[PDB]
């Protein structure tokens with residue numbers, strides 16, 4: 001599908017609250033999983049609200065050294081998304097260019113790079 | 126990420142209205158694209174509302190003979206999602222098993238098949 005649609009997607013209230021409650025439950029139990037932390041962070045970085053996106057970025061950065069290679073690909077993609085949403089354009093490009101270093105022919109990553117750069121330059125940065 | 130999360134995702138009000146307005150604009154112009162029709166159908170089949178999901182399924186079935194191979198993969202996946210959401214379990218399984226015929230090692234499709242079958246049997250069907 002469309003990278004622009006995925007990059008600009010806003011999570012629903014219902015899904016954000018569903019995975020927030022799931023994360024809170026595991027944290028209460030003292031047994032947080034990479035899977036649930038990622039599901040919650042995936043919702044947070046797609047929120048309309050700055051404080052949510054910032055929290056989602058922290059949760060993804062926590063996951064990064066714990067992920068297998070196939071997991072880290074997902075974390076880095078949504079770290080690019082989340083930083084883009086905060087106008088952390090430099091960091092967003094750093095994350096996507098890391099992905100491209102490992103996957104130079106990944107044109108989905110290339111399109112994400114274009115969409116971040118377009119926004120950054122539109123903002124005068 | 127998680128197939129269960131993707132299968133049960135509810136689209137946000139903002140995205141559904143964004144792509145609905147985009148589709149309406151192209152229809153008004155007389156120039157509907159596969160891309161925009163798919164974006165709108167992708168939101169519709171993730172709606173909470175039956176009439177939306179049904180309309181999204183029609184729009185995807187319209188796209189099926191117009192899609193390249195890589196496009197049809199996306200259409201069939203979200204035809205499985207949409208039919209699952211309507212408790213059209215037979216049709217949902219038909220769509221995912223079509224995907225598996227062409228991609229037998231696609232374990233994401235396999236997990237989608239399990240999640241549809243689990244729901245179908247839980248419903249006594």
Ligand code: NA
Pocket residue numbers: 011012013014136137138139
């Ligand atoms: Na919403």
